[PDB]
Amino acid sequence: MSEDTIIGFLGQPVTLPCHYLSWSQSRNSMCWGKGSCPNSKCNAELLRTDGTRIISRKSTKYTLLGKVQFGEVSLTISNTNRGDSGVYCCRIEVPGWFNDVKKNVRLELRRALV
Numbered sequence: 001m002s003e004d005t006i007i008g009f010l011g012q013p014v015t016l017p018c019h020y021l022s023w024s025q026s027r028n029s030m031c032w033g034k035g036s037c038p039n040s041k042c043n044a045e046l047l048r049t050d051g052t053r054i055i056s057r058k059s060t061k062y063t064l065l066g067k068v069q070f071g072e073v074s075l076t077i078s079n080t081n082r083g084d085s086g087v088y089c090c091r092i093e094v095p096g097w098f099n100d101v102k103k104n105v106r107l108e109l110r111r112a113l114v
Contacts, residue, residue, distance in 0.1 A: 005106040008080055015065070016075040016105045018090035023071035025051035029093040032062065032075045037089040037102035046088075047075060080109050 033042030066072025
């Protein structure tokens with residue numbers, strides 16, 4: 001496929017898309033990280049859930065605005081700066097081996113009439 005790319009401003013919020021309406025608190029967990037998806041878990045982890053909610057975070061820059069129990073786990077970065085560009089990884093953890101859903105998301109950050 002094509003992966004998906006998000007265009008956003010600087011000093012402004014941004015939301016990386018990522019769902020899984022197939023979600024279950026009793027079996028699913030999830031993490032966001034900077035960079036392409038590793039072979040296991042997230043690298044430069046920025047957000048982590050436990051099936052029903054956020055359990056860890058890199059800082060109050062990252063947050064999940066949707067509902068974690070309904071698979072709405074789209075990352076929302078708070079103040080954005082040119083440093084946040086790049087590929088991010090959304091990894092929805094499905095148990096067993098080899099079944100996880102990894103999704104790489106690019107993020108371009110531009111300026112306006114400033």
